[PDB]
Amino acid sequence: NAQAEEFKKYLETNGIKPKQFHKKELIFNQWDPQEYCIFLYDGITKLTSISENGTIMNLQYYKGAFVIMSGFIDTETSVGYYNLEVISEQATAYVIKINELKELLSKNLTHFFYVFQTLQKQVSYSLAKFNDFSINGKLGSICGQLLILTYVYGKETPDGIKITLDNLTMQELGYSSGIAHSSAVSRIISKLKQEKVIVYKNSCFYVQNLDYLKRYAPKLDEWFYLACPATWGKLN
Amino acid sequence: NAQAEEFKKYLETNGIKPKQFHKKELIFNQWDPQEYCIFLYDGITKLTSISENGTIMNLQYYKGAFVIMSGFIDTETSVGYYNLEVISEQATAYVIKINELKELLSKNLTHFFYVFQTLQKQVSYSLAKFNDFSINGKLGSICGQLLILTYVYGKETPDGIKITLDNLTMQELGYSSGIAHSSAVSRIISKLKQEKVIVYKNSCFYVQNLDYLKRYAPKLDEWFYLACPATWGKLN
DNA sequence: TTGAGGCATTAACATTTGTTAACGACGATA
DNA sequence: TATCGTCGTTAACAAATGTTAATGCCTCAA
Ligand SMILES: N[C@@H](CCC(=O)N[C@@H](CS)C(=O)NCC(=O)O)C(=O)O
Ligand SMILES: N[C@@H](CCC(=O)N[C@@H](CS)C(=O)NCC(=O)O)C(=O)O
């Protein structure tokens, strides 16, 4: 992306150099209250939350370039306690102090509008996801998540659309769709397989019937069409 | 609150005058995508979405002052096809075309930071809502919505906490929690009534065991503590 | 006073999902 | 080689939830 590159050159120009993170490494966490402005430049991360009981919840993934806020810009208080775990092998991200961000965006308006637009992307994303997950229950939740991962990490292959993700354990899918037990998600997956919707090959997932997921995730497909059209046309 | 008043005067200085809307009246709609930037100054509204089969989905409410984006500020494209129905008797809102917002914000930076902060409140809200509703299924979703309504529209009474909403039918809660049929909502509400959690009196809902809802909506309570701390202190 | 329609409560069945357990395939270690 | 853990299936049983129908309470219009 161009806006992302200009943003990079701006940050670096203002003495803000990137940091490197490895897999299983947290950029910020839900226990230390350090309000940051993460500009995930390269890599893949997952935003997670752990309850008092210890239950994990995968709220979303982030694939650079994108912006993640852990604190408000005016009050400089916390927007919510979450972790951002690196799940790719390596990732490069620009950690910015919450106070300096205001000084940086005040100076340049283009980059300001870039951050604003990434924010809108977050909003619309969350609304669509909430819709498609809420209506059709857990089957619809799984289907929606598969749609997201297929548009973001999917590549056409002889047998279908291969989702290029190193770790996609049943536990992870459950964490992304509010399912606590791997057996249940394994059952839903078994149904989808039997309906000739997906295949489990090479420890990976191959999506062969995209329309089936489109039915259970209308607002998500619509969203990718209205906000990530470059990512949407690669499969249409 | 106050930043919204300064924002009001700002809008009334650039020739952007408020428009009035009555109950059930829509400001923008899904089928006629004109990209606006609604600044709900006063009143209560609800953001809804209708599938192709007619299924309704209540994504959330909006009690002024707040900001709603129907289109992106850069691309000027729709962020998603949603409707905004007024559910209060009367509501005052400033309608702004999306192309004007970029200049109007470029002119003043404090109000830019206001809209930005409100958008961050939207983000945190959606994330917390997604986590709680998702973790404990439909019971937890009902508890979450009830907590939200209790913080935003609740007022302490000797009978508990009165949710000052005229129209809060079983079907409306269902739409707010992804439940299609009113009978199921009635069933859950009956369980809570038996559990000494709430009571249905004077055509309104009264909350007596806030903690019970806090258990099923931890991230939402956290959100009210972090994003709307006054609304949170009003009940603690 | 009557009748229609909408909303709430409940019951009864079907479908889905939660929860635990057993079995087998796989990798890794010694 | 054997042994231990982890993950994917499947089964069996319980709880939740989807779905429909019946009933009663209320308002409203004639
Ligand atoms: N950098 C890309 C992708 C940014 C990104 O990661 N967006 C989030 C939503 S705000 C996403 O697609 N997440 C995918 C997921 O949740 O797995 C863009 O500009 O849209
Ligand atoms: N103006 C009030 C309320 C703004 C508002 O409506 N915020 C949304 C969250 S983005 C909300 O609380 N919605 C409650 C609901 O969904 O009923 C404030 O800023 O605290």
Automatic annotation (TrEMBL), chains A, B:
Residues 136-211 form the HTH crp-type domain. GO terms for biological process: positive regulation of single-species biofilm formation on inanimate substrate. The keyword Translocase does not apply. The keyword Transcription applies. GO terms for molecular function: DNA binding; DNA-binding transcription factor activity. Keywords: Activator, DNA-binding, Transcription, Transcription regulation. This is PrfA. The gene is prfA.
